Design a protein around this ligand. Structure first.
Ligand SMILES: Nc1nc2c3ccccc3nc(Cc3cc(O)cc(O)c3)n2n1
Length: 210
């Protein structure tokens, strides 16, 4: 049973700005997804200190970067805290409303798109490089879900039946035709080194077969 939802007006507006504005420094999307993974990893590590049974769904805390030239996808996987159904549909959209507002005003005052993380809405920077985004996520005490959007004002949420994942979040970027430089090992390494060199979790860059 696939449910279809409208984005809140401000998020739709932000997504259009991101997709439509001329801005050549697209590489910052990666820093933002890795930073989101790090925050979700911090959250489950904190919670596990007062309740050790929260790591029964997996003890390892890490990030995998997985490019696939065949599918033309870049996948970021973390074993962070995960998201509930209520996160995917309501809560995250609600929190982002004020950050979007402030970000959009700041851009009029001479700030640039690369400052998006400072406003808590870095996730939407994925649309700099991706025509479609899919998020598979599993939170303790709740089922696995798939969220998906190609923008255009809507997103979908369903119960996920694919490979079960224990706990955490997997973001799948279906890249735009002219953005395949981000499947190259060398380019990905250069970007991680420049923008994400002090993340406190191991980051494994998978190599492709062919
Ligand atoms: N601010 C924000 N908005 C979202 C979001 C919106 C729609 C669907 C999924 C979403 N997930 C996240 C958090 C997130 C992003 C991420 O790239 C990795 C994670 O472990 C968690 N945010 N974080």
């Amino acid at each position: 049973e696939v449910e279809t939802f409208a984005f809140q007006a401000e998020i739709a507006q932000l997504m259009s700005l991101i997709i439509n504005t001329f801005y050549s420094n697209k590489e910052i999307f990666l820093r933002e997804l890795i930073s989101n993974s790090s925050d979700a990893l911090d959250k489950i590590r904190y919670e596990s200190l007062t309740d050790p049974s929260k790591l029964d769904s997996g003890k390892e805390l890490h990030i995998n970067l997985i490019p696939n030239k065949q599918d033309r996808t870049l996948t970021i996987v973390d074993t962070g805290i995960g998201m509930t159904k209520a996160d995917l549909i309501n809560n995250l959209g609600t929190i982002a409303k004020s950050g979007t507002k402030a970000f959009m005003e700041a851009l009029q005052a001479g700030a640039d798109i690369s400052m998006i993380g400072q406003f808590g809405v870095g996730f939407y920077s994925a649309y700099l490089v991706a025509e479609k985004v899919t998020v598979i996520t599993k939170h303790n005490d709740d089922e696995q879900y798939a969220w998906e959007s190609s923008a255009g004002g809507s997103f979908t949420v369903r119960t996920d039946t694919g490979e079960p994942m224990g706990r955490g979040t997997k973001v799948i970027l279906h890249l735009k035709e002219d953005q395949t430089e981000y499947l190259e090992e060398r380019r990905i390494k250069e970007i991680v080194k420049k923008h994400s060199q002090f993340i406190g979790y191991p980051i494994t860059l998978f190599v492709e077969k062919e």
